[PDB]
Symmetry: D2
Subunit: 189 residues, 4 copies
C-alpha cells in the first residue's frame, strides 16, 4: 500500500471543447489532482490511471444509448488534462505507474485492477478524478465490496452538479466508511 | 425471463421500533411493495428476498463501526414487514421464491444471486426495497456491471432522506439506463 | 494470517454407505485431516468448512444431470466424517471457525469466502478434503486467480482415481506454485 | 449465436523455436484449429483470441514457474499457421476480438464475461493450448459463470498425453461439456 487511482481526468471530461465535459468544476481541481498524484508517487505509492476507452458505433455497450461518444480510442479526447498529463509524460514508464483502459464506470469492472492490487498487497486505495457521483462512486463501491480501505481526495474529485457531488461525499464517509483527505493526503475533519 | 429482488424490507429497517429504521417513508411503501411482489409472482417471475444477516460483535465487518446492530441473525428484526411477510408465509416454499442472506449492501456481494439468475437465464431484474440510495443503489450498480437489464419499482423503493431517494432514481434512469415502473409493472415516463 | 479450508469431508463423500462416496482412499485420510485441522486451529489459523449443500429436484443445477443426489440439505450425508466432526462439535462456536454452504465445486463460487478472508487480511490458504481433482482443484484455481498463496496438505487430500490425484498434485506444484505440506504443516520436498 | 474462444495458439506455444513450446502435439492441431475457427465465423459466431501478454514483472507469480514467453511486442505472440491468416482476413471484424490476458484463464482480469453477456451468449466453444492449463482454467471459470461448454477435441492439445486425457475426462464428466470435432459435430 497505498495505491492512488486517477479516474477519467481527460480532455473529453475536463476541457471546454470536451465531448462530455464537466466544465468549470472539473477544471477547478486540476492543481489539486496533479499535486496529490505527484505527492503519492514521491512517497512510493502505486499510480493507476483508469481511463474510458470507447469505440464509436459499439451497439452492444448500454452506455452508447445514454451519452454521446466520448474518450474514443486514438483521439486527443483520451489525453490527460493539465499537469497530470505532464506527470504521465515524465513517469508513465515507471514500474509503479499504470495505464488501464476501461469500458464501464467502475475502474474494477472487466479490468485487472483488483489482481494488480492483490499482487502488491495493497490494502488502501486513494480515489481521485471525475465524476464524483458516477465513475468515482462506482469505483468506490466496488472497492468497498472487495474489502479495500478507501480514501477520497475531496479537493481532487468533481461533478457537474454540486448536489450530486455532495451526495457522493456523504455516501463515501457515512456508508462506505471512507476517509476524506486533502491534496496533502491529510485527513479532513 | 425476469426476477424481482426484494431488498431488506424487514422490521429493523421499516417498523417504528426498528433498530435502523427508515420510519414513515419506508412504511409508506408497504402496500405498493406487497402488491408488486404478488403481481410478479402471479406473472411467473422468480422472487428473491435478499436480507441483511448480521452478527453481534462482528469486529471484522466494516459496517459494525458505521451503524448500530441491526437485522441480527435469529431476531425479530429480520422478519419481513407487512403483507410482504404474509406472502412469504404463504409462498416461501415455492420453487420460484428464494431467501438469501447477505452481509454487504448489494444483494450480489458474497451471495449466489448471479449464479441463480444465470441458471434460469434471467436477463432482467426488478428492484424493490430499502434504502433507495444504499442497498438498492449498490444492488443496481452490481446488476449493471453484470449486464442485467434493470427495472426499478419507483413506488416500492424508499429512503429516510428524500434528496438521496431523488439522486438514486436519477442515477438509475440516466446513468444505468434503468426502466422506472409502477406497482402494476407499467413503465413511467 | 492463514486460513485452513476443509472441503466436503462428509459422510456422503467418505462413508461406505455414502451417496457419492470416494470410499477407502477418502477414509484413509481421516487421521491426517483431523490432525492438521486441530493443529491449524491451535496455531491461531481460521478454519472454514466448505460443504456441498444440494437440494433434490434442483433441475436448474448442471450438476444434477451428472451425479446422483448427494449432501442433501437436512440429511445425515452432510455430517462431517470421523474426528473432524468431533472437532466441529467442540469448536464450531469459536469466532475463528466457519461453516459455509456451497453449490459449485469451488469453495469460492457463490459464497462469501473471499470476503471473509479479505476482512481478516489472509494471504495464504491451506487446502484439505475431497476430491483432489474436483472441489480441491477448483478451489485451488479460484484461490490462485484471487492472488492467495496456496498450501496443499498432501496426506489430507484424496480422490477415488489415483491418476487424477497425481495430476492434481502436479498441477498444484508446477502450475499454481503451491506448497505441498504434511499433516504437521511442514513443507514436503 | 455462440462464442468460440481461441486460447494461446501462438508461435511461443507451438513453433519448434518457441520459448514455451508444446512441440509436435501442438503443431498437429493446426489444421483442425484453423478449420473450426473459420467454420464458427462463417456461421455467425463471435471469435475471441485470448492471448498471454507477459512482461519479462516480479509481482507475477508465474514468472517464478516458467521461462519468459509471449512477451508484449514480440513475434512469440503471433498466431501459428492458417489461424494467423484468418486473423489477417477478419481481425478487424466487429465479431472478432483480441484480448490480452495475464493468468491462465481467459476470464481472469479480462472483460470476456462482460462482452459475452452483452451479446447474450450462453455457450462457449473452447480451442487452443494447453488442454490441462489455460483451456482447463478457462473451462472451469466458464462453468462457474454458468455457460454451456463445448470442447473441440481435435483442436486442443497438451505436451503430456496423460494430462490431455485427464482434462478431456474432466470436461465431459465433471463440467458436463460437449466434446465436438472440427466440423462442430458432437462426438460420441
Ligand atoms: Zn464512458
Ligand atoms: Zn446492514
Ligand atoms: Zn456436489
Ligand atoms: Zn503464461
Amino acid at each position: 500500500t497505498k495505491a492512488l487511482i486517477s479516474i477519467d481526468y481527460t480532455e473529453d471530461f475536463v476541457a471546454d471543447s470536451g465531448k462530455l465535459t464537466a466544465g468549470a468544476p472539473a477544471q477547478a481541481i486540476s492543481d489539486a489532482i496533479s499535486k496529490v498524484t505527484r505527492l503519492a508517487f514521491e512517497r512510493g505509492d502505486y499510480i493507476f490511471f483508469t481511463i474510458d476507452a470507447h469505440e464509436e458505433n459499439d451497439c452492444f455497450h448500454p452506455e452508447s444509448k445514454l451519452f454521446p461518444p466520448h474518450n474514443l480510442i486514438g483521439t486527443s479526447g483520451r489525453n490527460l488534462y493539465g499537469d497530470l498529463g505532464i506527470f504521465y509524460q515524465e513517469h508513465g514508464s515507471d514500474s509503479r505507474v499504470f495505464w488501464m483502459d476501461k469500458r464501464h464506470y467502475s475502474a474494477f469492472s472487466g479490468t485487472d485492477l483488483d489482481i494488480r492490487l492483490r499482487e502488491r498487497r495493497v490494502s488502501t486505495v486513494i480515489l481521485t478524478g471525475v465524476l464524483t457521483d458516477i465513475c468515482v462512486l462506482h469505483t468506490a463501491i466496488d472497492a468497498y465490496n472487495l474489502g479495500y480501505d478507501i480514501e477520497i481526495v475531496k479537493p481532487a474529485v468533481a461533478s457537474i452538479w454540486p448536489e450530486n457531488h455532495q451526495f457522493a461525499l456523504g455516501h463515501f464517509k457515512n456508508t462506505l466508511g471512507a476517509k476524506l483527505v486533502d491534496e496533502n493526503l491529510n485527513e479532513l475533519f
